[PDB]
C-alpha cells in the first residue's frame, strides 16, 4: 500500500521521490526508489558535522577554535555567518549554524577545516558508506542537475549512514550526543517531516533545498518510549511550488505513520 501511495504522491509532485525508513524498535524497513541517486543539497551538512566531530575526538580539531573570515567568504544563504564577520565563530558555532540554519558559509568553512569534499567522502567510505559522494562546495553543490552523480546519495544509504553515526560508535559519546542535539535544534524543517509526524515525537532533522525543484529532509524520530525511526526523503525535478514540495515531504511522514502498525497521531 505504502509503495502505491508514494507512487501517487510522486505523480502529484511531478518529480522523482525517494524514501527510506528503518525502525530500530521493530526492525521494519521500507524503501521507495531507495537505491536511486538524488542530489543531497544541504542534507550533507549533517555528515560534515559528523566528520568534524570525529576530528575533534582524535584531537585534530577543537570545538572552541575560533575561525575568522571575511565578507568575501560569504556565499548565498548565510544567515548566521553574515552576522559574525567582525568577531569570527568557533568550530562548534559553525557546526550549529550549518545544521540548524543550513548556513552555507559555515559549511564551506567546515569543509575547508576538514580538507574538502574528498576528505568528507573518504570519511564516509571509512565508516562503510560506499554510495554517498561530495564533489563540490557551496553553493554549486545545490545545482541538482538530472543525471549528474556529483553530490548525491541514495535514500537508503543516507538513512543507513545516519544510523551508523547516531547509534554506532564512530563518534565518542559526547560527540554523538552533540550531533543529535544539533539535529533536534534544527530551525529549517518545521514544514517538512516535522509537520507530518505526531506531536509527541522528538525529532532531529536536516533539510536540503536545491535547484530543479529539489526539497529533501532526513530525520531521526523518537516516539515516546520507543527506539528511534530513521527517515530519509529526497524529492527532485518537482514541478509544484516550494510550499507544495514541503507538503509532499510532510505527507511522506503522514503516510509512514499510517502504514506503521500501532503508530498514529493523537
Ligand atoms: Mg512502534
Ligand atoms: Na573578519
Numbering used by the authors: 28 to 58, 60 to 238, 240 to 252, 254 to 296
Paper excerpt:
The starting point of the engineering efforts reported here is a Kemp eliminase we previously obtained through minimalist design on a β-lactamase background. Our design took advantage of the conformational flexibility of an ancestral β-lactamase scaffold to produce both a suitable cavity and a catalytic base within it through a single mutation, while a second mutation enhanced relevant interactions at the de novo active site. Kemp elimination is a straightforward proton–abstraction reaction that can be performed by a simple molecular machinery consisting, at the bare minimum, of a catalytic base. FuncLib does not per se predict mutations that enhance catalysis, but rather suggests variants with multiple mutations that generate stabilizing interacting networks at the active site, thus focusing the search to safe regions of the sequence space.
Finally, we have used X-ray crystallography to determine the 3D-structures of the catalytically optimized GNCA4-2, GNCA4-12 and GNCA4-19 variants, the first of which has a transition state analogue bound at the de novo active site. These particular structures were chosen as they are all highly active variants, in terms of the measured rates within the available substrate concentration range, with improved catalytic parameters over GNCA4-WT. The protein backbones of these new structures are essentially superimposable with that of the background GNCA4-WT variant and, therefore, the observed enhancement of catalysis is likely linked to small rearrangements in the de novo active site. Here, our crystal structures illustrate that significant gains in activity can be achieved without the need for corresponding significant active site rearrangement. To assess this, we also performed EVB simulations on the variants for which crystal structures were available: GNCA-2, GNCA-12 and GNCA-19. For these variants, the calculated values fall to within 1.3 kcal mol–1 of the experimental values, and can deviate by up to 2.2 kcal mol–1 from the values calculated from the FuncLib predicted structures.
